[PDB]
Amino acid sequence: KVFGRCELAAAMKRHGLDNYRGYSLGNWVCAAKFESNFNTQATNRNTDGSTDYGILQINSRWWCNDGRTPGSRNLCNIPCSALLSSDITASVNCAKKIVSDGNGMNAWVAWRNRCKGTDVQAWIRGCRL
């Protein structure tokens, strides 16, 4: 599913990401925009042989099992395919574990490079939340 900006903002709000660990909703929408272009089916292979999955590009080395990443820790205890669903629940729940892990949203390279320090509330402007 390719979400609209406001549609995704609302879904993330309903799943409790607004101000989760202090990160306002626009941070999460911004990260999703630049990680996946709001596409739940997005996949991208990394140099180390792991793959990133879904709207928040969650990596198979640490967070989910894709059956082809040796030494995967699978900390979210889910198959990576679950992160590609039109229902964002699994991605949100796993993301809550990641952002609690120590480096906050810096775990998402696109967030650090393209969202951090910018006016992220622009991402939720105009939306009925």
Q: Which residues are annotated as a binding site?
A: 101
What is the distance between the alpha carbons of residues 106 and 46, in angstroms, rounded to a whole number? 18
CB 50 within 8 A of CB 26: no
Task: For residue 2, list its beta bridge partners.
Answer: 39
Q: Which one of 7, 48, 52, 119 is the catalytic residue? A: 52
**What tokens does 128 get?**
């009925």
Q: Which is nearer to Ni ion, 23 or 108 (CB)?
A: 108
What is the distance between the alpha carbons of residues 48 and 68, in angstroms, rounded to a whole number? 12
| Per-residue x/- track, 51-70, Ni ion (CB under 5 A) | -x------------------
User: Residue positions in the annotated binding site for substrate?
Assistant: 101
What is the distance between the alpha carbons of residues 28 and 56, in angstroms, rounded to a whole number? 9
Q: Which one of 35, 48, 87, 119 is the catalytic residue? A: 35
Q: Which residue is nearest to Ni ion (CB)?
A: 52
Count the residues of the shown chain that bind Cl ion, applying the rule CB under 5 A.
1
Q: For Ni ion, which stretch binds (CB under 5 A), given 1-9, 46-54, 69-77, 93-101?
A: 46-54
What is the distance between the alpha carbons of residues 73 and 62, in angstroms, rounded to a whole number? 5
Q: Which residues bind Cl ion (CB under 5 A)?
A: 104
Q: Which residues bind Ni ion (CB under 5 A)?
A: 52
